Write a protein that binds this ligand. Sequence first.
Ligand SMILES: [Mg+2]
Ligand SMILES: [Mg+2]
Ligand SMILES: [Mg+2]
Ligand SMILES: [Mg+2]
Ligand SMILES: [Mg+2]
Ligand SMILES: [Mg+2]
Ligand SMILES: [Mg+2]
Ligand SMILES: [Mg+2]
Ligand SMILES: [Mg+2]
Ligand SMILES: [Mg+2]
Ligand SMILES: [Mg+2]
Ligand SMILES: [Mg+2]
Ligand SMILES: [Mg+2]
Ligand SMILES: [Mg+2]
Ligand SMILES: [Mg+2]
Ligand SMILES: [Mg+2]
Ligand SMILES: [Mg+2]
Ligand SMILES: [Mg+2]
Ligand SMILES: [Zn+2]
Ligand SMILES: [Zn+2]
Lengths: 62, 101, 212, 136, 25, 91, 80, 97
Amino acid sequence: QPIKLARVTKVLGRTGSQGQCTQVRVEFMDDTSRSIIRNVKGPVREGDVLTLLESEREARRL
Amino acid sequence: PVGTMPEGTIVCCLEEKPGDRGKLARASGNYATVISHNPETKKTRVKLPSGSKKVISSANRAVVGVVAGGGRIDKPILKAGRAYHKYKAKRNCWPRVRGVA
Amino acid sequence: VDPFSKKDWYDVKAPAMFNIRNIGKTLVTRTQGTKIASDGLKGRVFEVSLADLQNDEVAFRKFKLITEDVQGKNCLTNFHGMDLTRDKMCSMVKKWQTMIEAHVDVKTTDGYLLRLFCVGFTKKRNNQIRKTSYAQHQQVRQIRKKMMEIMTREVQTNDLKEVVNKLIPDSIGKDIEKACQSIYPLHDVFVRKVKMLKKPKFELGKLMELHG
Amino acid sequence: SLGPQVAEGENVFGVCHIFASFNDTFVHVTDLSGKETICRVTGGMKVKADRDESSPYAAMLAAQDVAQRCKELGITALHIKLRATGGNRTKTPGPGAQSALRALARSGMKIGRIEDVTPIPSDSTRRKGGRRGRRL
Amino acid sequence: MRAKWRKKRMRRLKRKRRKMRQRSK
Amino acid sequence: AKRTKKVGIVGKYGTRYGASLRKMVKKIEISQHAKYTCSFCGKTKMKRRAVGIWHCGSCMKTVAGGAWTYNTTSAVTVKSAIRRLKELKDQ
Amino acid sequence: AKDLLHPSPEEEKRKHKKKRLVQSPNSYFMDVKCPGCYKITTVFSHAQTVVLCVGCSTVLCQPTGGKARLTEGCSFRRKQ
Amino acid sequence: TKKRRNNGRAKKGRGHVQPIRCTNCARCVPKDKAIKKFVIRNIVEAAAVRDISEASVFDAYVLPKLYVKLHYCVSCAIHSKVVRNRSREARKDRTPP
RNA sequence: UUCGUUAAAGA
RNA sequence: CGCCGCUAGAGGUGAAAUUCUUGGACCGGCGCAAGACGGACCAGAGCGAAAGCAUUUGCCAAGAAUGUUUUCAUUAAUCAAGAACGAAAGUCGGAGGUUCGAAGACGAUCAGAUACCGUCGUAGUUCCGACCAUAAACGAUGCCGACCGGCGAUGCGGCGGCGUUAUUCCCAUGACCCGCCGGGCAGCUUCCGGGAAACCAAAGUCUUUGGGUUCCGGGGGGAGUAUGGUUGCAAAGCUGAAAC
Ligand SMILES: [Mg+2]
Ligand SMILES: [Mg+2]
Ligand SMILES: [Mg+2]
Ligand SMILES: [Mg+2]
Ligand SMILES: [Mg+2]
Ligand SMILES: [Mg+2]
Ligand SMILES: [Mg+2]
Ligand SMILES: [Mg+2]
Ligand SMILES: [Mg+2]
Ligand SMILES: [Mg+2]
Ligand SMILES: [Mg+2]
Ligand SMILES: [Mg+2]
Ligand SMILES: [Mg+2]
Ligand SMILES: [Mg+2]
Ligand SMILES: [Mg+2]
Ligand SMILES: [Mg+2]
Ligand SMILES: [Mg+2]
Ligand SMILES: [Mg+2]
Ligand SMILES: [Zn+2]
Ligand SMILES: [Zn+2]
């Protein structure tokens, strides 16, 4: 059960019923340049290292 | 014999065991359906008028076609007189009295 | 209990001259009591695609196999049918074309009888403005008769060796494409399905003849 | 146990059926024949909630359990057969398989070619809904 | 009220009055 | 003159045994009392013998027919199936 | 303002057979030289039936909807 | 008055069209009236294509597809964001890019 | 996913 | 339903439950039996008088259109009465019954459901014989004939074009490109004109009012109702008021 870390490359947009989470396609530090999209609530910039508890998900955009 | 005819052959007056000169499907307007032949263990399924699929031998015989006189129960007897003459022709099967009465 | 520790492995041997004979490995329960280990193995089948039998041919045009018997920890299989993949069959079905179908029963040289199919899609020519590309349906009936007729005199006197040697490079489809252009330029005619429905006898001698 | 193959380098193949539905997700590992089931973990075997057994999280947990059992029983490669409720229901697969393919490709389980062997009817047999069909 | 079900209830009333006529001719 | 408008041949009975039963007996009484065209002599002399038996008047060729008609539709279907299985691939 | 009284002959040819003024027939009579010995046979252009030569008994014109297609390309003339 | 000239469907020469069932609500709609589209989807999400390509047996020798006749009705398609309402001058248009 | 009804005029 | 293997859940929903499950459900592989159904090919495409019609092959007759220096010579158009078909549902017999499913029984949500949702299921939905003759049976637009703009396409024939591709090769048919003709389903623009407008190449050629003919409307309800008559096994259909 690994717990990995990831720094933000780009910011796609904001999502939620309250408009609170931010769909972030972050990147993978510990592996090669692969792509998953994560829902992050709270303020975030480009370069923020993020704590990931499960690197198996993928959020969708609209 | 049923081993000669192909499957789906509508026949009548067939035999249970080979050599009893015609037992199954002998009433008027009835037939059987021959299916499911076997190369080894010479058996043949026949669909009877009751709907049962009986496995029989492949050496017993059957006349090809249906029994003439089909539709005999289409006419209502329409009076007690024709039923009296019918049962007087057949046998004394008619003291039909209600068991409650 | 752990039944998979008790279960046995038989590897699958394809019949001769695909290119190779290795297919895979299957599980056997064991030989115990009435249930012999060769009971279900006589009835097991396989549905294996290409690019592992014909040395980098097209990935579609799958093949149906059935295990005939077992011979020294090696379960030997034999031809049972030939299909195509669902994505390739659903592809090349255009809304502005015509899909001509055919099917025919035929008996081989030996006692194997098979029902083989045929699909043919009409073709838009190069430098064509009319986007419809239909036919007068008499050419469609004529080409149904033609594609029903061609397969009869291929698979009339040809047993499993020659019909597999014809269905590997799609020589039937190329022959229909050659005899097809006089009627209409039909695009990518295939067979799409064929299955064995009559098997005469075990014939281990004919199986050894199939090997060589 | 060593398993079927000694001195690895040749892939041991198995057929992995993925039955994706709107209410559940099946992942199933069989040999190349189609009879001997190797492993079978559904969505309800991993998620207690009945409303969340169709979830991609349920599909990933079932896929990780299936991949762990397949690594313990000693197979390497999987030919994936995707299917859905295609008789009269929606022919498109559910939301679980789209992440279950990722969950199989993550933890071992080298994927061969993938085919959509879905049961498709010939000529659109009688639908469960009715004249005016499902409402609300 | 729909004209369809108005005509059907007047049809049922016609059937009821017809059965009343057949009951007391 | 058209003396009966609905009962037809069944007017020999009268008022008894129901309109639906008399209507269902009417068609088969017409079928059993109508003369049929003989397929052998070409005449229309098929006289009704007992049930199952039909008899043409000329040339005395007795035929085993239906119970109330000359040919049952099921019997024609059986005859078509028997000739089809006859000429199907020579047994 | 179209000259209906004196139209163009190309226009009168491109118009329909009966819709135009004179209603001239599009058919003709052609003289097929049969290659048997010498014979030249007159035949209608839109021939509906077969044409058999009385000398060599060969088919001259095939029955075809429209106008009759021919055999090997024997010559013919337009006589009006 | 008549809102359209086509009266919804495309039946102009014939008199009856055999109905085909809908996908969501499963309602019988004639096929010249129902929203009949053809979805072409890759079976793998575009972020998992790289994962399956790295974990594949072959070195990119298979690319499967998914072709589905999607068949909605006009009662569910407006609710499901396909055939949104337009203007009177905008109803004379063709397929969108 | 559930969420009914508000008399009559009087501009 | 018959076998083989794994195993604790498999349905179904917004959520659960009614249902099946260590007697093995669901799942995968093989086969058997049943009946319904003809997708993708299927289109502002075709045919039929409409209702309607889509797997392959054979047989039976019928027909639109076209090519007709072919035939008869006004044989024609519309139609009171009358007659033939006529979706679905329903009714009466015989056969069978896979799915769906009127009614019905439950499980849910709501103040309450007997309703929309889910599970099972009767008549029916299937075939061959008889009846009923109704629909938003719609083009909400009678039939025949003539005239009055254009454009690009499509289905079927016919015609013209040392163009291209198809056999063996000049000789004929096939597939594509350009144009014309006839009738057919249609599309776009328009100040041709109409109409209250929507809109319409017909709903135009209508106060500048007349080509031939049939059926129907006279404010809205009562009411397609009662009473008559007539048809039907029945449900019901046709004709059809008045008082207020
Ligand atoms: Mg009794
Ligand atoms: Mg008694
Ligand atoms: Mg007493
Ligand atoms: Mg409105
Ligand atoms: Mg209609
Ligand atoms: Mg109240
Ligand atoms: Mg129980
Ligand atoms: Mg099963
Ligand atoms: Mg009906
Ligand atoms: Mg009875
Ligand atoms: Mg019945
Ligand atoms: Mg219900
Ligand atoms: Mg049900
Ligand atoms: Mg009832
Ligand atoms: Mg009416
Ligand atoms: Mg009329
Ligand atoms: Mg043409
Ligand atoms: Mg030609
Ligand atoms: Zn006689
Ligand atoms: Zn819908």
